[model samples]
Target chain A: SGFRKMAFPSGKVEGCMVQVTCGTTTLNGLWLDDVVYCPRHVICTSEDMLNPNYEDLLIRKSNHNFLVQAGNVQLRVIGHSMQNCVLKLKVDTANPKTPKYKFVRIQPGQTFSVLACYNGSPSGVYQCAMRPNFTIKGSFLNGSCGSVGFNIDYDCVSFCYMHHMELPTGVHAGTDLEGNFYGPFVDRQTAQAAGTDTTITVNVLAWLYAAVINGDRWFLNRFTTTLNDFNLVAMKYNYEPLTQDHVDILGPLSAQTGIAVLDMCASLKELLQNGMNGRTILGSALLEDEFTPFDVVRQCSGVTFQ
Target chain B: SGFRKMAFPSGKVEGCMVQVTCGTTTLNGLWLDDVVYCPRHVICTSEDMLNPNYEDLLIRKSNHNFLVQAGNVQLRVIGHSMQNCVLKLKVDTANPKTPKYKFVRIQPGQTFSVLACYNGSPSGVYQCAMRPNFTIKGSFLNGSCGSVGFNIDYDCVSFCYMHHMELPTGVHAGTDLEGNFYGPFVDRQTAQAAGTDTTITVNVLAWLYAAVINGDRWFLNRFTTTLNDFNLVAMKYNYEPLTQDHVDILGPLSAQTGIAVLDMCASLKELLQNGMNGRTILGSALLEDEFTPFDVVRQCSGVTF
Candidate 1:
């Protein structure tokens, strides 16, 4: 029987990267554990290419640090014809304090290592940008010498870059933003190339806050639909209180979001740890006192608390 | 608006001793606070008789011992002109072993002192036989020397003989064999003369045992129609483990005929003590390992536990 699979992106990118195209027609409403796919073929390799082992990328929300684990990493743009292009990396936040960095500049078929750490915090999402440094029409190389846009599709090997190197640590390629799911395949190279843009919908961090506020141990687990009976037992008993330790773990992330996610988490932890039963904890009266139904509707998505 | 006052013993009797009827239509279901009339016409002679006090008469299950603040006291009962008449007393069983002594009998219409030191270890329940040395036939005394039965209408005052004089103190009351409802009253004088004769039950030493087993402190209040909310709370929380103390208080009452009466009491106690809006303690799955529904049904009347 045909199986199902789902994918989530770590949002970390590597490689000089040309145009990225992803396709997802085979996967639909399926769990990745149930899916089976064919092995991928690798096409291009360059020592200086931004070949990030997506697996080694650990996205830490605590300090807003994306730690790349592997050493001797490189970025390479692959193309039969040589062309110059400005290399830029875009980060979600927009501030120079902790700026996003790109390794090095390079031409088609050429490779270079990202020498300097990109510093600057940007508000929006971060992505690699390579546009002409100066604007001009298609003349005198269009002054494109300063900046150039490059499109490199490495044939059947297009969706196979991740397969070429050690698979990015936790990167899996299958699903898209529009709920059109896909893949449990080896790496992101295959994922991005074969993956479609599905949609650019915002990935809501609602469950993260919800879990903290509700004192749920596995907040991120809500993204999946499996019932966690153990968590339910812990919740009913108020197993542990929201302590200074919890604040220490979740405080910084909450501050960065400008949302009192930690406060809610702390409150939930206190309520649960204190052994507040359904009467006062989940009761309508208490819920109304803390937050209105309107606030939940406006601010939350997916799961319903009340 | 006409405010009506109901009087007991509607009919008049002509002799010093008249026929004392139990379960009279006039006296059923009446809560008498005090007695104003006595055949001897004695005024304040004996602390048990002349004093208009009901609080000292009935023992509460929680306290285990009846408060007889007065040092010397005697509960005397003048029975109908019969060879043998049973006198029963209901004992409170919540705490049984406090004052441990034995029986002390008193003569009819006579004043005696109830020694505080004589309150004995009640054995749950007990009944005493108070038989006047005479009889009556054809509505007349069989012999000129036979004593006459006292015609008393005061339900609370009529059953005056001490069911427990100095015996082990415990909850006393009649019960049917089924162990459904518990009642009559606390003493033989009350149970027998009250015309509740299905069984003459008494406990001399098991008061504390019964209380810890079956008594709920909250049930000793005024009755109401709504299910006792406290019972529901206890039920939801699964606190049904009966200690030796509980058994000590509630053990000896013989089951009464009416199951609803006991259920009403149990339900009321639960609500008053535990609060409403909780789960039912009786039918909870959590307590299944300890007690079965049948046990509760057998203990109380007309309800599945």
Candidate 2:
């Protein structure tokens, strides 16, 4: 997608400059709507230049500064060009274990890709709920960048959330997990309108699948379903639904383990229904709309979709 | 006071280094308990090196970086050598106006001298309350360093509160307000035990005087006392209680303005009672215990004690 100007905080315009150099051509770019901007061969506007044509390119917001990189062209957005917003983190009285190491603040108009982990423990991953007046674009828990953590894609809404990361690591090529994600149905009229009648079972199941992929199992407690059998068969297929061949092989094991293998289409409907019903998981829309009814049915060719 | 090691967030120790040099001698220093470390001639330990011998010298904590200044030596505490604590500022949902320019998060074990102004307008100044787990050393509002604002001294207790400020400025010589201030009685057994029996009248009045000296009049609304008349002469005297000579000259003016000229001794008592009673201003203990009854009785010369 073409880059859009990243929105500054209320009443403020302009921010740290993102300078770009393509070959001999150098141009100044603005922080864009999409943090991961894939530019064209020749960049145009500030947004266009920032929206570079590289899959592995990333621009990180570190306080008042920005770190942008692609190939050998690395740029930093620093002082004078940037406006400083007085930021303060509210004292979280809830979790006292790892009080100091909990969250880090990102400037307004910034998009951060972080490993949203639970405070204190590196293995325990958790999802954050959508903050009122703020929007979380996407999030998931999975093994990425050589570590299993929650990958969150969020925009700076009116107010930002304190992002928690238990373990810190960098991401290179092939570290990002595309798809197998959840959506933030924040203020989405259609999603809220359709999902009101959705049941707790469907909502819970959808969250269960999402948590499984995210490496988060906290939400599994709402039911008595044993994760041992459910996870073994699912983990065997790389978290994807098993194919007929593997199902034939693992069917006896799955049955012996007392796991229910529902239809991929039916499972998807419940997930989508949760999205339409405005139920969110991990501070985002429950499921993205990209997986259409037709695609959901067609994607089940091998075995089923988890 | 001499400098001590700045306490980092719980379970963590060590911070950005504070390197100091006196002529040919250079020594490495640690983050001190006191953000403003006034040193002796020769600097020693990281804390000693950071604790330099200069009055105008001040150290500021801007995130993990420390800006230390004394005489010709101006050093910056930057990357490496420093342990980075993940810092986050919580969103202030209360004040929507100037929402973006409210509070900034300081790294753990850091002390800042800020002009704590209310959001939106530069003129409006307010006091902060003491946080539960944290301790605010001292704070006051008055014209210091050319501009008038809140001068706060606080420690990072277990958790921190969202400190608010509107204006941004620097402080130098004669810019710090020393005497007129409040204290954070955070978990202080003595202050709390003595204060429980205190009445609201004493608490409100002490806060009233503190508000006046701080160039802050926000707390005056609790009482119907008109400020237009009360503020004119007080502002004329630099917010200090009117001296005997000043009272003689401004007595008629004060009477005409409907402002009561209370005895300075009685007034100090009310302020002290507010302190012992556990009321605070600008996120600190209301009053320090240095002022004794004898000092209060003897300070008034050529006038009734």
Candidate 3:
């Protein structure tokens, strides 16, 4: 209800990054994507990334992950790196509480290459388990040392960069966004683009109805005949006078426009009472004076004929 | 500003009515005219004087007495009916220190038809004065007689009546009769018929200036050309700017007609500065934004230049 501003200080280290391996040690062999550098990754290089159109970015979900290609190589990575040296890895898992594997520190002179893999699981779990089964072999740079074989899980756990990509311009959350029975249509598109998985279509219709019922003049004036046609269809099921509170709220508008809810209902009821053959009534005839005490009282009062 | 209701009791009287007589007071030689009867005496004859409009009564003056003529003949003389009659007579020798006087009571049935002569000196002397000279007379049959004479000195006396005369309508003493300064001129003939003094003519001209300065719309519309002419006159006079107080009082009217004191003054000044043959310069340009800022700064700065 009231506004609050949250401050995030820059460069704060958060969680530990660890490498996984099939070793008895707490830190051992861990398979990680290779450090891939691309001058411009194709998926990330699209102009759409700067200002993604609502419909384009929202309803179409295809290859939406960050992509990086290795320079003069075939390796590609999809996550962050620390200080341009250590690569970052996220162990995607179904159950976030379970640890996939442990880590092993690699020796300083040893070097190895890794291949990036995309293991598709409904919850990104397969990649978390497979990242730990990598083979490692070390060799001296001067060609004088003997070969050494060991699993190294260099879990270069670095700081997390808390990304706060603000909602696209003119987009808001809650009723300002798309969901059931809320938001302006424009805002709904933005929310839908943001991957809101709700029946926004039904909500949009309800919002239009609300806009009409609440006497939003712009909406009502634009869709007058359409609203009448919709009312005719609805009147086939039931027709009743609007409640007094609703009348009180809408009375000024109706009076100014020489319309009444009862007149509207009557037109609607005529279509129902006579089926589709009934003549169309474009507007109500009831002016403000029709609701005067003398007329309304006479019309509403009960009578008995003997 | 506020209302007050004041009532003077009928019985409470504060002023004296004095009678100074310069004539002889002989029964047959002296007479009073236009004598106003005391309320007590008039009350005794209320039946005979029923529905009397005192303005219509006639006073017949005779030697030593007066007679009143009413409808038909209501006068009746019943003799020897005087009672409590005392008279005081005085003679003076022109002495400032001492004057001589005597009191005399007349017996019942005694009529003073004789005049006592004073023959000492026409220039030098004998004068007769009377005190309580009037009789409180009662007739045996009529029960009310006459008041021969009476003089009121220091004593306060009052008269009471059963019915009070209504105040004359359409006459106000202090303020304008209509409480406004505009006319519907009240003419003299109509005013006098309404029982007002005809000598004074009261004209209220405040509403005329109210109409002019205050720019009453009816007058403004009716006399638009005349107002323009007056504006030209005002320009000729080089009239000073009207103060804010004056503007505040009259602004609503002038604002409605797109006229202000500055416009009036400019027009007048143009006419005055150039002459009657000068080109009429409407000062709409000069008075585009005339207004009074009613605040502390303006107030402390004193009168606007």
Off by over 4 Å in 1: A1-259, A276-295, A298-306, B1-265, B275-305
The best candidate by TM-score is: 2
Best by DockQ: 2
**Single-chain TM-score of chain A, each candidate:** 0.19, 0.20, 0.19
lDDT of 2 by residue, B66-178 (tens): 33432234544332221111111111121111111111232212232222211111211112222111223222132111112221112222222322111111101111122
Q: How accurately is candidate 2 docked according to DockQ?
A: 0.01
Give lDDT tens digits, candidate 3, residues B99-192.
1211133311111111111110000000011101111111011111111211111122111111101112211111011111112222111231
lDDT of 1 at B193: 29
Better of 1 and 2 by lDDT: 2
Please give the distance, in angstroms, between residue B219's alpha carbon in candidate 1 and its true position after superposition: 14
Q: Show where candidate 3 strays beyond 4 Å.
A: A1-245, A276-278, A281-306, B1-305
Q: Candidate 1's residue-wise lDDT over A1-306, tens digit each? A: 000010101112112111211121111010011111111111112331345332222121111111111113211212111111111222222222211322222211111111001111000110111111110111110000111111111111111111112222212221111212223333233433222211100011222443333333432221221124323433454332223443454444454343454334444434434433533321121211112121222222223222
Per-model CA lDDT versus the true structure: 0.21, 0.24, 0.21
Per-residue alpha-carbon lDDT of model 2 for A9-52, expressed as tens digits? 11110121233333343322222222211111212224433333
**Residue-level lDDT for B170 in candidate 1:** 15
lDDT of 1 by residue, B1-305 (tens): 00001011111111111111122101001011111111110111234433423333322112222121111322222221111222122222211212122222322111111101111110001112221210000110111111111112222113222211111111122211111112223322221322211110111112111222332222233443323443354345443323333333333331321223334335434443555453322212111121122222222221110
First chain TM-score, candidate 2: 0.20
